[PDB]
Symmetry: D2
Subunit: 422 residues, 4 copies
C-alpha cells in the first residue's frame, strides 16, 4: 500500500518517459504540501474571520500590494493578519507561522522612488518579513532597496521582481545580491512578447534552483476564479507546471485580493501543488542538483547533502533541523528531498521567512529552556517529533534524519543523526 501512494511507481522509473507513463490519478498524495502559497490581501480577504479561513486553507505568506491603499489601510491589514494568526497560538504543536510581505509600487517612469522609500520605512516600522521589490532592472536597484530598509531592516528578505527585458538580461547580477526572485508575469507579459514568458519563467526557476535561492511564480495562475467557483483547465495546468518547473512559491493576486472566491482559490492551489509535488521525478532531479551544487568546505553545506542522501536511502518521513536564521533548512531544501524539512526555531521572524523555501515546515519553539545546552537541543528535536506526529508528518516506526550543530549560535551545523520514531 505504501509503494502505491504518492506516485511511488512513477518515482521508481528508469527514464523520465517511463515516469510519465506510470503517473496514476488513483495514487493519492501523502506528504504535506511543500510549495508555499502567497495570497494578496485586499477587500475580499481583509477581515479577521476571512483570514482565519485562508490560514486553514493553506495561506503561508500574506502579500500587501503597496500600489494601492494608504499606510493606514495596510497597517490595519497587518493587524488583522496577526490577529488571525495568533488566534491559533493556544495549540503549540500545531501553530502555523504566516509571513507578511510588502510589494512595492515601483520606480514608475524614474531608480528608487520617493514613495518606495516611505513605504519601505513603513515596512521596517511594522516588522514585515519580506519585500517584493517591483521592476528590479540591475544590482544597484537591490542595493537601493537594502539601504532604504536601514540598520533596523537588516533581517528582511529582498525578493526581486523580474518584470521586463532588462531584468531578464541582467538576471545573474540581480540574483547574486537578492535573497530570491519573483517571476512577475503580469508586467513581463506586456514588456516582452506573451509567447516568450514561459522561457523566462523556466530559465529563472532553473537558475534559482541552481543557486539554492527561493523563486516565486506569480500572476493570473487561477485568474478565472476572480468571478467563477472553479478554474479553467489551463489554470490548473499552470499551477502544476510551476511546481514541476521547480518554483518554491506560487501566488494569488486578484483571486484573493478582490475576487468572489478567495478561500476556494487558496484551496485549489493547495490541492494542485500536493498532486504536482508527488509527480516530481526525484531520481533525476536529485542527481542533477547534487552534481551541479559546487564542492564545498562549509560544514552546513556538507552536512546538508549528507542528510538529504541519507533521507532518500531510508525513505525518511522527515529531516528535523535546528535553525536560528533558517539557513540550515534552506541548504537542505536546495536538494529537493521528498522528506519534509521540519525546521525548529526560536526566531518568530525566521519561522515566517522559511516559507520561501520549498518543503520547509517551520515550528516556532516556545517551551521552557533547559539548563544544559545538550539537553535543550534534544528537547527541540523531541518537540519536532511531537509536532510532526500531531500534524501527520510522522508515525511510530518511521525513520527521521536529525540535523544539529556542535555549539550554540548560527553557523555551526555539522551533525546528522539517524533516529527511529518512538
Amino acid at each position: 500500500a505504501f509503494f502505491q501512494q504518492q506516485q511511488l511507481p512513477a518515482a521508481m522509473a528508469d527514464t523520465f518517459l517511463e515516469h510519465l507513463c506510470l503517473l496514476d490519478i488513483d495514487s493519492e498524495p501523502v506528504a504535506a504540501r511543500s510549495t508555499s502559497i502567497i495570497a494578496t490581501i485586499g477587500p475580499a480577504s481583509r477581515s479577521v474571520e476571512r483570514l482565519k479561513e485562508m490560514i486553514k486553507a493553506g495561506m503561508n505568506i500574506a502579500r500587501l500590494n503597496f500600489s494601492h491603499g494608504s499606510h493606514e489601510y495596510h497597517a490595519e491589514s497587518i493587524a488583522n493578519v496577526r490577529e488571525a494568526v495568533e488566534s491559533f497560538a493556544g495549540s503549540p504543536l500545531s501553530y502555523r507561522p504566516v509571513a507578511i510581505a510588502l510589494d512595492t509600487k515601483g520606480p514608475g517612469s524614474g531608480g528608487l522612488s520617493e514613495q518606495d522609500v516611505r513605504d519601505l520605512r513603513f515596512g521596517v516600522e511594522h516588522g514585515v518579513d519580506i519585500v517584493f521589490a517591483s521592476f528590479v532592472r540591475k544590482a544597484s536597484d537591490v542595493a537601493a532597496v537594502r539601504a532604504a530598509l536601514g540598520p533596523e531592516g537588516h533581517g528582511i528578505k529582498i525578493i526581486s521582481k523580474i518584470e521586463n527585458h532588462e531584468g531578464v538580461k541582467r538576471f545573474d547580477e540581480i540574483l547574486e545580491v537578492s535573497d530570491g526572485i519573483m517571476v512577475a508575469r503580469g508586467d513581463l507579459g506586456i514588456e516582452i512578447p506573451a509567447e516568450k514568458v514561459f522561457l523566462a519563467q523556466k530559465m529563472m526557476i532553473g537558475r534559482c534552483n541552481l543557486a539554492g535561492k527561493p523563486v516565486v511564480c506569480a500572476t493570473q495562475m487561477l485568474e478565472s476564479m476572480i468571478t467563477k467557483p472553479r478554474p479553467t483547465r489551463a489554470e490548473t495546468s499552470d499551477v502544476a507546471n510551476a511546481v514541476l518547473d521547480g518554483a518554491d512559491c506560487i501566488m494569488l493576486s486578484g483571486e484573493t485580493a478582490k475576487g468572489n472566491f478567495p478561500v476556494e482559490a487558496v484551496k485549489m492551489q493547495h490541492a494542485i501543488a500536493r498532486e504536482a509535488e508527488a509527480a516530481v521525478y526525484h531520481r533525476q532531479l536529485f542527481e542533477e542538483l547534487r552534481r551541479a551544487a559546487p564542492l564545498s568546505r562549509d560544514p552546513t553545506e556538507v552536512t546538508a547533502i549528507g542528510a538529504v542522501e541519507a533521507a532518500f536511502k531510508c525513505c525518511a518521513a522527515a529531516i528535523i533541523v535546528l535553525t536560528t536564521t533558517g539557513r540550515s533548512a534552506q541548504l537542505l531544501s536546495r536538494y529537493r528531498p521528498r522528506a519534509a524539512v521540519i525546521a525548529v526555531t526560536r526566531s518568530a521572524q525566521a519561522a515566517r521567512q522559511v516559507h520561501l523555501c520549498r518543503g520547509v515546515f517551520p515550528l516556532l519553539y516556545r517551551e521552557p529552556p533547559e539548563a544544559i545546552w545538550a539537553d535543550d537541543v534534544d528537547r527541540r528535536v523531541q518537540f519536532g517529533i511531537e509536532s510532526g506526529k500531531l500534524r501527520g508528518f510522522l508515525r511510530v516506526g518511521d525513520l527521521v534524519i536529525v540535523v544539529t550543530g556542535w555549539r550554540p549560535g548560527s553557523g555551526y551545523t555539522n551533525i546528522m543523526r539517524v533516529l527511529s520514531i518512538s
Copy 2:
C-alpha cells in the same frame, strides 16, 4: 561553415546542455525560432469561423485541421461548413508557397451503454462527405472503438479514429483503448468534471507519454486560450498551458469556443502558432531522443529501422529536413515518433494521407499530382526533387544544405528501407 549566428538561434545553446537543469538555465528569450511550426493546430468551426473569408484568414494564421462538433448543428449545417473549408483551402491552389492541405475531423456527440443512433448516422455522414478523422467522444473501452470502426463501414476504413478520453474509466482502460485506436485526445473539459480538477494534469502527462512511447498521435484539448473568447490577449496561465502541452509531447493542440464562437478566432490561432514555435525550439532533444530510442523495442521492420537511422543521421549533420516518400503516411509517422528537430517533408500522391499526417508532429505534407513516369526510379527522383524545390520555395532549404531522404526499394506501401544523405544543389 554555419557560423556563430546559427548556433545562437532556435535555443541551440540550451539544446547542447549536458543536463536538463543546465538546459533550463540556458533558455534565452532573445534566441529566435527558425524552424517551421511542427505542432498542428486544430480549430473548431462555428458561427465565428464558418465564412469562406474567415476560413482563409484562419488557414493563413496556421489552422491545419478543421474540427466539426456534431454535438450541435444539423447535417446540412456541417455539410456547408465542410464545403466552406474546402473552398477556402482550394483558393490557394494557384500559389505553391501558400497552398496547404487542411484535414477535416468529425467530433461525435457521444453515447447509453455504447454507440448511439445519432453517432451511427453522423459517422455515416462523415464517410459520405470524405472526412479524414473522427474524434470519438467518451471512449471508455476497446469495444467502443470497435463499434466506431464498424460504423465507418465498407468505404471508411482509411479514416483515422482518435479516441477522446473524458472520464475515469477511459483513463483506467487507456492501454486497451490506445492499442486499437489511431491516436488519443486528452478531452480536458469533461475529464475535469469526471475526475478531480487537480488531477487532470497527471492524466494529460501520462497519456501524452504513453502515446509518445507507442508512436501514435496525441491531441491536447479544451480551454487552452479560453479567455480569448472575449479578450484580444490570453492570460499568463493560458500561454503557459499551450507551451507545456508542446513540451509534454503533444502532437496537436486544439481550440474550441475560441474559434467556434469567440470574438477573436484568427488571433487565437495566431497565438497558438507563436507559442508552439517557441516551445518546439525549447524541447530538450538530447534526452528525449535518447529515451525514445531506449524505450522503443528492437525491430526487424525495415521502415522502423530506416526511420531511426534517418533521425540519427539528421541530428549528426543538423539536417534542414528529412524528405520521405509515403503513400499511407506510415513512413512519415515512424520518423515523427523519434521527434527529430529536422522537418519531415512527406511527399505523397494520396490527398487523404496528406491531410491525415497533420496528426503527427513535425510532418509537412506535400501533395504530388504529376502523372507517373514509366521508369519507376525516375518517378522516385522527380518526387524527391519536388520535395527539395518545395523546401527551397518555403524557406526550409538552401543550396549547400544537407537533407536526409527516405525511400523504399520497390513501389507500393510497406517497403521503406533506404536512407540517403543528399547535398542540396
Copy 3:
C-alpha cells in the same frame, strides 16, 4: 568548471592536478580515460590490501619486518605444504615482526594471519586433514580462513562447524576454483564472509580464455553485496626470478583494482622467489596508481542506485558519510567500530577518503584489512568513566594519529562516524569536523 571553481581557488590548482582529479571530474567514462595523466601523482594512502604468502623466502623475522614496511597487510599460510610445526613457527615469526613496531600507533601496523586449506582433493566435502588444520587455526588464533575448492553452501557450513564454538569470529573467505563454484556462486557468497578468485585452479577447471569473465562477474557481485573479494595467482609471476615484472603483470594488478578487488595476492612471488620485498613494493606502487584512476563519479552513482533502500541506521549513516566526504574532498572518514562492520559499510561505497577505523579489538583491527580503504588503529587505553568522554577520546586519537601520519593536515575536513550507545550495531551519527 563552476562545480569546482571555489574549491579550486581555496585548495589550489596543484591539488586538483594530483591523484587523477581531472579524470575524476569527467562527465563520461571515455573522457575519464582521455584525461588519465602519467604526471598526476597519487597522494592517498594505498587502499587495496596486499596478501603475501609466507614461505622460505619470507619466513625470517628480519625479512618479515621489511615486508611489513613494504606494505604486507595479510600473511597467508598455505596448508597444502609444510607441517603444523612449520606453520606455528611462521605464525610466531610474523607476530614477533608485527610486535616490533608496537611502541606507538604511529609505527604499529596490524597484520592479519590467514590459513589457506589444502582442500577436499578427490573427496565430496571436508577432508580429515582440513578438520585438523582448521582446529590448528583456532588454537593458534588465525584471523581468516581461505577455504579451498568451495563448490556449494554446505561446504562453507562444514568449515564453520570445524572451527568449533571458539572460532566463531574467524572470517571465512571461500575460494572459487571450478565450474561448480562459479555456477553456485550466489549461494556460496550468501553464507561466506567473502570470496577469493583462485585463478590458478580456475584456469585449469574452465577454459583459460574465460577466467577474466568469472573474475569480473565475482568481483561485481561481491561489490554489489558489500563483501570482500580477493584477486589471486600469477599476478606478478615473473618476479619469482626477475627484479621487474612483465607488461601483462603490471596491467593485471592495475585491472584487478579497477575491477573492484578489495585485496590482491602474492603466492610464489613472496613464498619462494628471489625478490619478495620488491614484489610487495610493486603491488603497492601499482595499486596506488590504479586506485587514483578509479572513476568514482559513475562507480558511486551505480553502487548507490543498485544498493536496495535500507532502514538499518549503520547503512544509512555510511552512505551519508561517503556523500559528505565527496562533497568536501575529505581527507579521511574516522569511524569507531567493535567488529569492523561500520567500517565495512563505509568501504562498500568506495569513498576516495581513507576510512580510519578506531577499535579496541585486536582481531577486528587485523580482519578489516579485507575491506578496501580501511586503515585500522588499535586503541589500547582503558575506558573513561563517562561513555561520551571515552567516545571523544577515541575520535581525538584517530585525529591525532591521522595528523602525525600525514593522512590529515590542519585545515582539512574529516567526517566522523559514531553511535548513540555502547556495543556493536548502533552506529547512527555523522559529523563534519575541521582539523585545527
Copy 4:
C-alpha cells in the same frame, strides 16, 4: 528465440548499469560473432616457413610485422616473399580468401634527434617492396611523423603510418602526434623502461581512449602472452592483459617473441583469437555507443553522416553485418569508429586497402577480383552479393538475417551516402 538472447553475453548487454552488466557476465554464454580485434604477429625464425605461415593465417593472423631492428634487407625480402606465397595459396577460393597486411617496424632514432640514416634506407626498402603499414619507432613529436612520410617519397603516399609511443615525450606530445599519424601503437616494452612500470597502464588506457575518440586505430603491444615463448599455456595475468586490452578499446593486439622466436607461434595466435572473441562479447555497447555518439562532433561529411545512421540502424534490428563498399577503406573506418556489434564486411577491389583495413576493429575485408560490369548499378550489386556469399560461407550470415548495406551515389572514393536495410535470402 530464447537461445539467441542467452549467447554472446546478451543478458549482460541488456543491463541498465555497468555494475549489473558485470554481475550478469556468464562463462557458459558462448561467443557467436566473428573475432573483431586484429592480431599482429611478428615474423621471425619460428614463423618464416611458408607452411607455418599458412597455419598462422588459418589461426587468425591478420597483419605480419617485420621487425627491422634485426636482420638484413635480404632477410626481410625473403620474409615478405614467404608471407605473400602463404597468403596467395588461398586465392583460388575467392569467397574465403583472407588478406594479410605487411607492416614494417623501424629500428628507430637511437641516440639521434630524429630520422636515422638506417631508417631512411629501410623506409625506401618498404616502398620498393610494397609494405602496407609502417610502425614508426620512438615517435616524440609531429615532425618525426613528417620525416617518416617524406622518406616514403611520392610512391609511398598510400602507406599507413602508425606512430609508436615509447617514452615520456611521446606521451606528453600525444595529441600533436595523433593529429598527423594514421594511428598509434602503445609500445609497452620501451614505455615500461622510459616511465615507471606502474604507470604504463595509465598511458595505455589514455592513448586507447584518445584514439577511440579520434576514430583512428590503436595497437596494444609487447609481453601480452610472453610466457608462451617457452610454455604451451599462458599465465593468468597474460590472459587478463589480452582481455583488458580489448575491453579498453584496442583495435589490434600484438605478438612479438611469441611468434618471432618462440616454440608456440600458432598456439599464441589461437590464444589471442580465443580471448579476443570472449572479451568482444563482454563489451558494454549500451554505454560505449552512447558515449562515442555523444563525443563525436557534428559533421557535414556524407560518409560520416551515413556511417552513424548505419550503426544506429544495425543496433535497432540486431543486424548480423554492415556490408560496405570501399575504395580506400575510409567508409569502413567511419563505421568501425562507432563500435557496432554487427561485423563490418568491407568489399574492395584495392588489394592494399583490403590489407590496411585490418587496423580498424570489426572490419572484415573481402578482396573482389572481377573486372567492372558495364552497368555501374549491376557492378555495385555484384559486390554486395559477393559480400553476402562470403559472409554465408564464413558463418557471418544466414538466411533470414538482416544486414545494413552502405554504398555511394557515383563511382570513385569519397561519395558514400546511402544506407539500405536488406533481408538475407
